[PDB]
Design an enzyme around this catalytic site. Structure first.
Site: not given
Lengths: 235, 4
Positions: A30-31, A89-90, A131
């Protein structure tokens, strides 16, 4: 005594900010709404600490690796420190480029004491908003040196947990980090600044969701220090 | 609020 890093080199150092907001459709990620607020805040906050700030947007995993490789091959001899900020993100040990994942280890290895000699003995700061897994915090009511030395990882969240970002105000961690740096950089050692960041994220923020699974959750940031000296942004 |  020498209990503190020499921070009066001609330059404070580089502040590299990687801001990943939009991802390749094929990844299905997601953005990251709100991340521009984070990137602009970090830019301003670190500019005022006299860092040379480079903002980078929407990098592939390949671009992320090449950027880090190139920056590590620069001569930082006139620079007191290095700062790298990662917004993406992660997952556990992982940060996402726009087209796929990057080992955090791969990025940070470029700056090892044996691999970036002009940074040896100098503080290398990695600040990570991403994350680290999928756990949710429900809360409760109230002469050689090691090659891994002189690194500091300011993680937004605990090992294994989600990290929270507000689409309007930006991430809990980065907004808190900037406010604490603004208020305290001329006063507190960096560990003590990050402890206040910890407290502010822990106390002032809680998620609001229509989805029971994601509602009323809390976050605690995670300071990981291999520093050998006290760090003050002033001198 | 969203997760990363």
């Amino acid at each position: 005594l020498d209990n503190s890093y020499k921070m009066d080199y001609p330059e404070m150092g580089l502040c590299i900010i990687i801001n990943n907001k939009n991802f390749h459709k094929s990844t299905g990620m997601t953005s990251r709404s709100g991340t521009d607020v984070d990137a602009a805040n970090l830019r301003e906050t670190f500019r005022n600490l006299k860092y040379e700030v480079r903002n980078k947007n929407d990098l592939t995993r390949e671009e992320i690796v090449e950027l880090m490789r190139d920056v590590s091959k620069e001569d930082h001899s006139k620079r007191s420190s290095f700062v790298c900020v990662l917004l993406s993100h992660g997952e556990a040990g992982i940060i996402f480029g726009t087209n796929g994942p990057v080992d955090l280890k791969k990025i940070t290895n470029f700056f090892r004491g044996d691999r970036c000699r002009s940074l040896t003995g100098k503080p290398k700061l990695f600040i990570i908003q991403a994350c680290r897994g999928t756990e949710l915090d429900c809360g409760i009511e109230t002469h050689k040196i090691p090659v891994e030395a002189d690194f500091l990882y300011a993680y937004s969240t605990a090992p294994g947990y989600y990290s929270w970002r507000n689409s309007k105000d930006g991430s809990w961690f980065i907004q808190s980090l900037c406010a604490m740096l603004k208020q305290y950089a001329d006063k507190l050692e960096f560990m003590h600044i990050l402890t206040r960041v910890n407290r502010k994220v822990a106390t002032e923020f809680e998620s609001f969701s229509f989805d029971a699974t994601f509602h009323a959750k809390k976050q605690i940031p995670c300071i990981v220090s291999m520093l050998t000296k006290e760090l003050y942004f002033y001198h | 609020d969203e997760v990363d």
